[PDB]
Amino acid sequence: PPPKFLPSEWHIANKNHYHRAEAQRSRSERLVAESQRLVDEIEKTTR
Amino acid sequence: EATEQSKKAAYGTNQVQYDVVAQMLEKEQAERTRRLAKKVQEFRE
Amino acid sequence: LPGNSFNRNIGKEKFHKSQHWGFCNNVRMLVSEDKPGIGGELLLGQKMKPKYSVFPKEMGTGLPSWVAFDKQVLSFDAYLEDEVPDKSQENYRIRCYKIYFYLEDDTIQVNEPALKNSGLPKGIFIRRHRISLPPPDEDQFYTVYHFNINVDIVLYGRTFKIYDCDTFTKNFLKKIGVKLNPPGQCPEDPYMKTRR
Amino acid sequence: QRECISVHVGQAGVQIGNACWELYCLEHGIQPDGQMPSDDSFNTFFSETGAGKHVPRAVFVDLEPTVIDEVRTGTYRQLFHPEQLITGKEDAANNYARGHYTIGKELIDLVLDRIRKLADQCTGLQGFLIFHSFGGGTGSGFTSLLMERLSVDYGKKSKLEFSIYPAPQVSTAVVEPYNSILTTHTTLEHSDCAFMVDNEAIYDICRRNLDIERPTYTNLNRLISQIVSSITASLRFDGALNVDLTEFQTNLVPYPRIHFPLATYAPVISAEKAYHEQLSVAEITNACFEPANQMVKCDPRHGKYMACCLLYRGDVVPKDVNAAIAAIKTKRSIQFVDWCPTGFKVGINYQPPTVVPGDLAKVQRAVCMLSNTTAIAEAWARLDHKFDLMYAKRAFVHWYVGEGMEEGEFSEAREDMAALEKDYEEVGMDSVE
Amino acid sequence: MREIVHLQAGQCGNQIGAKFWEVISDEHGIDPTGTYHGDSDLQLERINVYYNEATGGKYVPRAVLVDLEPGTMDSVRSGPFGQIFRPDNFVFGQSGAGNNWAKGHYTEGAELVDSVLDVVRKEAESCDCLQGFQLTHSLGGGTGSGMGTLLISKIREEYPDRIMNTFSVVPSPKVSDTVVEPYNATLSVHQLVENTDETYCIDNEALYDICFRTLKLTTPTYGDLNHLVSATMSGVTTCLRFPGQLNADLRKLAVNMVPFPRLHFFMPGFAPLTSRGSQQYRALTVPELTQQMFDAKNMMAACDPRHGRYLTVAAVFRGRMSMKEVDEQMLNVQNKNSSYFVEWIPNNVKTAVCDIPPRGLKMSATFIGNSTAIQELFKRISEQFTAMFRRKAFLHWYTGEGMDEMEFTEAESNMNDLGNPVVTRGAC
Amino acid sequence: MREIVHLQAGQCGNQIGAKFWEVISDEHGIDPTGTYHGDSDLQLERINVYYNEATGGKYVPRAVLVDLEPGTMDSVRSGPFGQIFRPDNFVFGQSGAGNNWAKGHYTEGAELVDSVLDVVRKEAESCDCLQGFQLTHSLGGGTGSGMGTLLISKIREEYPDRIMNTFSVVPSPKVSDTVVEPYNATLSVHQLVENTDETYCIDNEALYDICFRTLKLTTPTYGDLNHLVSATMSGVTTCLRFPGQLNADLRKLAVNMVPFPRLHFFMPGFAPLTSRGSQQYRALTVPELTQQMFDAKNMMAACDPRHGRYLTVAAVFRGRMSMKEVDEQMLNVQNKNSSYFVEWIPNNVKTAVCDIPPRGLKMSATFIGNSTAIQELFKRISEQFTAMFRRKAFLHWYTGEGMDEMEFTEAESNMNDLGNPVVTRGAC
Amino acid sequence: VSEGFTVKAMMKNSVVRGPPTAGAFKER
Amino acid sequence: TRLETRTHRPNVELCRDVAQYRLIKEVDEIAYNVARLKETLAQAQAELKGLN
Ligand SMILES: Nc1nc2c(ncn2[C@@H]2O[C@H](COP(=O)(O)OP(=O)(O)OP(=O)(O)O)[C@@H](O)[C@H]2O)c(=O)[nH]1
Ligand SMILES: Nc1nc2c(ncn2[C@@H]2O[C@H](COP(=O)(O)OP(=O)(O)O)[C@@H](O)[C@H]2O)c(=O)[nH]1
Ligand SMILES: Nc1nc2c(ncn2[C@@H]2O[C@H](COP(=O)(O)OP(=O)(O)O)[C@@H](O)[C@H]2O)c(=O)[nH]1
8 A cells, every 4th residue: 555644744745735836826927927018018119 | 620629528528437437336336335244244133 | 448447346145166177088178068157157158958858846856867757658649641652552641650758868769550461661660869849940859848639740851640649648748737638530541441 | 177085084084074064065055965956066075976966075984883873864864975984893992003003904995995986086186185183093093094095096196184183281082192193103294284273272262252152063163164165165166366275285384294284264253243343354364363263272473484375265355465464474473484485375265155054154254374383383392291291101002002003103203203393493493694 | 460379377377368358359349259349440450460260250369278277267268258269279187286386397287288389389370470479477376387488488499480478477575375486486587588588577566556556446356457467468469450650569679678688577567547536637648648657656567667777668659649749758758867767778768659549548558668677576586585495495395296406506596697687787 | 874872781881871871861952751852953963873763753762771680770760861761672681690700701691692682783773874882881790791791792793893982890909899800800801802992991999089089079979970981971972963173983083092903991081070169169271171181180090191101192172162272282281291192103192172062061071091001900900810810719600600711811811912012002 | 390290290391200111121 | 021112122222221220120129029929928838837
C-alpha cells in the first residue's frame, strides 16, 4: 500500500495546495492587468 | 566675426549645460547613498 | 558626454563573477557562450533562458530530468503522403506512424508499426534526436507543449497528423495541464480496405 | 579556473569549517542540500555534478567519529560527498605524536587519495586552504603529516594554513605547549603563509564589541569564516585591485621562516552600536591597527610591523584607502621594520560582506588585515618557556615516547625553535651603516 | 596608412585599455556590438588604426590581452565593451603571478609568451604599413612588470624599426599597493630603458590629485583614473587619426622629445579639466589652457617639474584654434620660466594641433614632458630597492623561481647609471 | 553530362556518406522528403551528377549502400536525410565482418559482392556519360577495408577508364578502435595502390585537432567529424556541379595532382574554419583563406607537411573572388616556402575557382595535397604491422578464413614499395 | 628563423627552415 | 499599400521625404508591437496551462 502518512504532513499538504492556488491566481491577475495595459497602450500609439 | 562670437557662445553654453547636468546627477547619487544607508539601518531593526 | 569625470555609482548588492575564460581538453577558448556578467545580468548580446522544457512542480524534488523523469515516453499516432515510383502499395496512403517523446532528454522518435500484407521499410522512421521547429524560427526545439490530440506536427518537411495518443500520454498531459482535444480517427487506407 | 581545495583537520578544523560552509553556501546561493535554488562563481569552493548538486571542494578529516558524525546528520547531511568526510575510530588523545607516527599513518593515504581526486576535478588550483588547531593530536600531528605529503605530491601549489594558535592565559589542554612546539618544528618548511588566531582575543572582541559576555565557539568560527570569505573573494566576486592566494605569500612572508602572519577583521560592531557609528573606510582601516581588535593577544605597539595586507570588501573608493593608509603611515604608534620601505598590499573586492542569521551586523563596508608583526615573538617565547618548564623534569614524555617519536625530537624541536626566536629579534635590529 | 597594435598586460593594463577602448570607440563612433553608428566621415576615414575591418561592417580592436590569471579577462568581458574584443586575442594561463617578477618573466610567462607573440604577429601581418605597438601595464607588481617587459623584448627583437610605447603605472611615493613593487619596478625599468621608444610614467596619486584639486570629484573610481589615462592615450595618437595643421604622429613626437636614447621617460598631462563648480567660472581659451597645461598640479606622475629643468616639452592640441595664440603662449611659457628649461636646446617645445576636439570639449590639449624631474621617481625606487635588497628580504622567492643576485645587481647599477644623465643635463 | 556513382562501405563509410548526402541535399535544395525547395536555378542546372530524376519532379541520390551487417543500413535510413535513397540500393548481408579483412574479402563479402556489382551495374547503365565512382570507407577495420578493396578491384576491372575517388579513414597513431587496424590497413593499401585514381587519407586524430584547436568546440561528435569530411568531399566535386571561371573536374585535378600512377594519396583540407564565438569577428579574404589552407593544422591527415616536400597541390576555391589575388597568394606561398615544394615541378600548385559558395559562407577554399609527408603514415602502419606480425597474434582468423603468411608479407613489402617513391621524389 | 607555413614565413626577410632529409640514397 | 503606391512615382518626384522614413519606422513599430502581443499571448497560454 501507499505509506501511512502523519497528521503533520496532512496540514502541510493542505496549506501548500492553498498557497499554490493563491499564488497562481495572483500571477494570473498580474498578467490580466499587464494585458490591459499593453492593449490600451498599443491602441493609443497606433492612432 | 558674428558667427565666431555665436560659435564660442554655443560651445560655452554647452559646457555650462554639461556642468549643471553633472551637478544635478551628483545630488541624486548623494540622495541615493543616504537612502541605501537608511535601508541598511532598516535591516538593523 | 564622456569626459574625464562623468560617471555614476551603483546600489547593487550582487557582484558574482562568471568564469567566461577557461580551458577544456587542453586548448584555450571562451569555454561557454551563455554565462552572465557581473551580478547575474545578461550581457548585451545573449538573450536565452528556457531552452529545454520547463516542466511544472510534478516530481519537483530537485532531481534532474534523467532521474525523476525516467523511462516514461509520450506516444502518438500519425500519417503522411507522397508519390515517387518505389512505394508501399497505392495512391493516397494513410501510412500509420507511432511518435514517441522521450522525457529524460526532450527528444522525439518516429517509428513504423505493423501492417499485415505490407512491404514497407519496417522499423525506425526517425532516429532519436532533438528535432528543431519548422523554420519561421529554426533555433528553438520541440518541448512537450507542442504536442496534443488532433494536431499537425511538422518534422523534416513532413506534416504528421496526430489523432489519438495513448492512456499514459493522456494522463501525463492532463497532469501537465494542456486541455487535450477530442480524439479523431485515422482515415482508412484504400489498400488496407481492399485487403481487409 | 579559480579553485581552492580546503582541508579541515581536527575538531577545530571541522567545527571552524562547518561555519565557513554555512557562509560559502549563502554567499553563492547554494541551498543546504546542494541544489542552487532556481552563476559560475561557485567554482572556487563548489563543484557541479550532472544532477546539479553543487558539491564542496573539501576533505573534513578527524581521527574520532563524534565531531564529523554531526556534519553527517545535520542540516548539511546531503551537501558533503560521504567520502569527503574521512573519519577514524580512536582519537589521537591530545598527543601530537599519536596523530603523526601512530594512528596518523592509517588515514593519511585515504585523505591524500581524495585530495588527488579533488585536484583532478579542477582546472587551476589557486592553493590548499588548511584549517588546523595547534593544540590537539590531529591539529598538531595529522596537520604535520598532511603538510609534508601535501608538499611533495603537489609541489609549489600554495598551502596557506589557518591555525588556532595557543593562548596567553587560557589554554585547555596541559600538553598543549609540547604539541605546539612540535608542529612548528615539523611545519616550518612545508607551509607557506600560516595565518594565526587565538581564542582569548576573539573572546575579548566578542565582549568589547558584540556585547556577548558569554561567547561560545560558534560565535568564534563564524568570524574566522568571514575572515576567509575576505581572503578568498577576489577569486569569486569582482573588484578593482584583486588579490589571488599566490599573492598573500609573496607580500606577507619576508624571510622564509617568518611565515606567521596575524589576522584582524575591521567592522566587528553589533547592530545597536552601528546606529551611532559612520563605519567609514578610515574608521575601519584605523580599527584594524587598533591593538585590541587584533585577533591574537599581542600589543603590536611593543614590536615592529614587517608587511600588512589590507583586503577591503564592499563600498570602498580607491581614494579612501590611499588617504587612510597614508594617515596610518604618519602615526608614531605604528612603526615598521627598516627593510620594508613599502609595507602595504591593498585589495578591494566589491561584494558587500554577507550576513548569516546570527550576530555580526550587516555592514556596507569591511576590511581584513594580515600583519607579520614581530610581536609574535613574545608568543613563541612564552610557548617555549612552558615547553621548557615541563621538558626539564621530562613531563608527559612517556606518553609521546611510547607511541613512536624518539625523545631526541622533543629537544631538537625547542632547539630549532630558539633559532626562530633569535630570527625574530634580529630581523628587528637596524644598521648604523 | 599608419596603424597601431594595442597590447595590455596584467589587471592594471587590462582595465586601463578597456577604458581606453571605450573612450576611443566613443570617439570613432563604434557601439558595444562593434557596428559603426557615427556622425561624420572623418571618424570613418582613419578608423583603420585601431580597428580591423570584418564581415558585416563590424570593427574589431587590434588589441592583445595578456594576463596570467583569467579573472580580469572575465571582468573585461562582463564590462560594457567586452563583446567588441576578439575572442582569440585573450591569451591566458592556468597560473598566478603572485606579484612576482620572477614568476612573470622566468616561468609560465615564458610558456605563454609564444602564444601571445603568435597573436601579435597575426595582428601585425594583417596590415600594410605598421607604425608601432603600445602596451599598458603597471610598473610595480607581477605580470605587467614581467610579461610586459618580456613581450616588449621579444617584439623589439622581431620588429626593430617600429615605435614602442609603454603606458606604465609607476609605484607611489606614499602608499604601496604591492610590498615587492620596488623589486618589480627596478627589474621592469632595467628592461624599459634599453627597449622602448616612449614611456609614459603615470602615478595613481597624481591622477587622483588631478581628480580632486582640478575636477573636484568626491568618490572617484579606478575607472575614472583609467579614463584620465585614456584621455592622454587618445590625445597622443590623434593627428594620425584626424586632420589638422602641423600633424604629428608617434615618431614625429619621438624625434623631437628624445635627445639621447635612454632619456625617454615622460610625464603625461591632459588639462582642459574644469570642475563641477569652476566650469561655469571659466573663460576657456588657449592661454589659460596652456596655464593648466604647464601648472605643476596636472602632472600624471608624482614628480615636481620645478625640481628639475625641462629637457623637452610637447603639446598636441585638438580644436579649431588660431596658431598665433598657441605659438605666443608656448614662447611666453618658455621665456617667463627660464630656470625650468635648459638653454642648450632652444625652443625645446613641440607644438602640434589637430582640428577635431574631444567630444563635448571645444578646445583640448595633451602634454608630454621629458624633464630632469623624472630622476626623483627612479631615486625613490632605488632607495626602497636598496633598503629591501640590503637585508635580502622578499628575495628567496625570486631566487627559488630561478633568478640570480647578478640580475638585481645589474638592474640597480643600470638605474643608478640612468640617474647620471638626468642630473648632468640638469647641471649642463 | 558528367555524373558520379556514390558508394558507401562499412559503418564509417555509411555515416560519412549520410552526412555527405545531407550536405549535398542542403546545397542543392532538396528537402528530407526529396522535393526541391530551392532559391536558384543553378541548383537544378547540374543536379544530374548525383541525383537521378523521377516523375513528380523530385530527385533520388545515386548512392549504393554496402554493409555486411543489417543495422547500419537501418541507422542511415532512420537518419534525417535517410529516406531519400533507393531502397533497392540498400544491399546488406545476414552476417558479420567482425573487423576481419579476410571475412570482408574472401568470404561473405565475396558472396554479397555479386548483388553489389549488380546494383552498381544498373546505376551505371542508367546514365549518359559516366565520370566514375566515389567510395567512402575506413582504411582500418573490417567491411569497408575488405569490401572496399573488393568493390574497387571488381569495378576497376569492369570499367577501366572511369575515375575512382576513395575517401579512406586511415587509423590514427594516438588512438585506435580495432586491434587489427595495422593488419587491415596494410592489407588494403596494396589494392589502393593499383586501382584507385584519387585516394584521400583522412585521419581521426587530425579531425580531432581541427575540431578542437581551430573550430574550438567542446563536445564534437562523429557527425561533426564526418561533416568535416563531407565539406571537402563536396568541394572536390563542386566544379562539375556549379559553373565557374577556370573549372576543374575530377580528371582535370587528377592529371595535375598525380605525377606518377601510384602517388595519388592526398592530404585533404578545408579552410574557412572558425570557432563559433569568433565567426563574426573574421575578415574573410583570399590571403586569409590561403593562410588557413597551407597552415599545418587544417590537414585532415596526421602528416605534418613540414616533414616532406610537396609534390603537387590543388586549391579549389568557391565564391566570387579575384583571380589576381589567388595567383598572388599561390606565388607568395611558393616563393616564401620554396624548400617545402619540389623544384623539378615548376609551379606545382593547381588552381580552380567555382562561383557558388556554400550556404552560410562567402568564400570557400578546399585543399588537396600530395606531399612527401605521407611516408610517416605509411611507415607508421608498417612498424605497427611488424610489431603485431613478428609474434603473429590475431592472425588465426585470417589463416582460418583462408589467407597465407606470404599475403601479409606481400602487403607489408608493398607498403614499403609505396613508401620508397614518395621518399625518392622528396629527395630528388 | 621560420619553421614552416606559419605567419613567421610571410614577413619581409624571413629565412625558412628546410624540410628534413629522407631515406633515399642513405645507408640502411 | 502606401509604400507600394509611393514606389510608382516618376523620375525626379520619387523622393526621400519626411513621411517616407516615418512610414518605414511605422512598419517597424507595428512589427515590434505585434511581437509584444505574441509574447504576452504565449505567456497567457502557458499560464492558462498552469491554472488548468
Ligand atoms: N569556532 C569554533 N572553534 C572550536 C570549536 N571546537 C574547538 N574549537 C577550537 O579547537 C581547539 C581544541 O580543539 P583541538 O585542539 O583541535 O582538538 P583535537 O585536534 O581534535 O584533539 P583531540 O582532543 O585529541 O580530539 C579549541 O582551543 C578551540 O580553539 C568549535 O566548535 N567552534
Ligand atoms: N589607472 C588605473 N590603475 C590601476 C587600475 N587597476 C590597477 N591599477 C594599478 O595597478 C597596480 C597593481 O597592479 P598589478 O598588481 O601590478 O597588476 P598585475 O600586472 O596583474 O600584477 C596598483 O597599484 C593600481 O594602482 C585601473 O583600473 N586604472
Ligand atoms: N569520420 C567518421 N569516422 C568514423 C565514423 N564512425 C566510425 N568512424 C571510424 O571508423 C573506424 C573503424 O570503422 P570500421 O571498423 O572499419 O567499420 P566497418 O567498416 O563497418 O567495419 C573507427 O576507428 C572510427 O574512428 C563517422 O561517423 N565519421
